[PDB]
Ligand binder design. Sequence first.
Ligand SMILES: OC[C@H]1O[C@H](O[C@H]2[C@H](O)[C@@H](O)[C@@H](O[C@H]3[C@H](O)[C@@H](O)[C@@H](O[C@H]4[C@H](O)[C@@H](O)[C@@H](O)O[C@@H]4CO)O[C@@H]3CO)O[C@@H]2CO)[C@H](O)[C@@H](O)[C@@H]1O
Ligand SMILES: OC[C@H]1O[C@H](O[C@H]2[C@H](O)[C@@H](O)[C@@H](O[C@H]3[C@H](O)[C@@H](O)[C@@H](O[C@H]4[C@H](O)[C@@H](O)[C@@H](O)O[C@@H]4CO)O[C@@H]3CO)O[C@@H]2CO)[C@H](O)[C@@H](O)[C@@H]1O
Ligand SMILES: OC[C@H]1O[C@H](O[C@H]2[C@H](O)[C@@H](O)[C@@H](O[C@H]3[C@H](O)[C@@H](O)[C@@H](O)O[C@@H]3CO)O[C@@H]2CO)[C@H](O)[C@@H](O)[C@@H]1O
Length: 95
Amino acid sequence: DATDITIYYKTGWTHPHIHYSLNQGAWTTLPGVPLTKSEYEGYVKVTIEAEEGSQLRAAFNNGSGQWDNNQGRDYDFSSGVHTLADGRILSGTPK
Ligand SMILES: OC[C@H]1O[C@H](O[C@H]2[C@H](O)[C@@H](O)[C@@H](O[C@H]3[C@H](O)[C@@H](O)[C@@H](O[C@H]4[C@H](O)[C@@H](O)[C@@H](O)O[C@@H]4CO)O[C@@H]3CO)O[C@@H]2CO)[C@H](O)[C@@H](O)[C@@H]1O
Ligand SMILES: OC[C@H]1O[C@H](O[C@H]2[C@H](O)[C@@H](O)[C@@H](O[C@H]3[C@H](O)[C@@H](O)[C@@H](O[C@H]4[C@H](O)[C@@H](O)[C@@H](O)O[C@@H]4CO)O[C@@H]3CO)O[C@@H]2CO)[C@H](O)[C@@H](O)[C@@H]1O
Ligand SMILES: OC[C@H]1O[C@H](O[C@H]2[C@H](O)[C@@H](O)[C@@H](O[C@H]3[C@H](O)[C@@H](O)[C@@H](O)O[C@@H]3CO)O[C@@H]2CO)[C@H](O)[C@@H](O)[C@@H]1O
């Protein structure tokens, strides 16, 4: 069973960050943790260390105060691998 929370994110932002609360804990210090270039063009990625059965709530930003926050609701990610593209989350890698 999956542990870490791994996220692929479709963006053209050069300095994308993920700001998050893991398992309802503290929010990261703004602007959060950078995502890194992925193996897929147009996607960056990050793996957030977590235990089995974890979930985090997240808002993305461009490292200079522009946001992607799911209509103000934030995005929910669970343990395992998911891809966020254009506001929609699916399991696994870029389609
Ligand atoms: O590469 C082809 C495309 O390149 C350009 O798109 C870029 C944008 O310039 C970037 O700003 C960024 O897009 C941001 C977007 O600016 C931001 O609002 C946000 O959009 C989300 C939205 O929050 C969400 O609720 C849902 O509607 O999906 C949106 C994305 O569709 O997040 C974006 C991602 O960080 O990155 C895109 C490339 O991914 C150019 O403008 C496009 O016309 C061109 O096709
Ligand atoms: O604490 C000792 C440090 O003092 C000096 O750093 C100062 C800067 O000179 C100030 O400008 C400011 O820095 C801001 C910065 O202006 C701002 O752009 C932002 O930078 C972020 C960025 O948004 C984010 O996307 C990511 O890239 O990280 C960047 C760095 O965090 O935020 C800065 C504050 O975090 O304040 C700092 C001190 O806090 C001196 O230059 C440093 O060498 C020294 O360590
Ligand atoms: O809700 C309106 C509120 O928005 C602004 O507050 C933001 C902070 O300025 C910002 O730092 C961030 O706070 C988080 C910290 O970064 C993190 O270290 C930690 O302590 O969790 C914080 C959130 O719980 O986000 C808040 C909320 O957007 C603005 O400054 C406020 O005046 C305003 O009331």
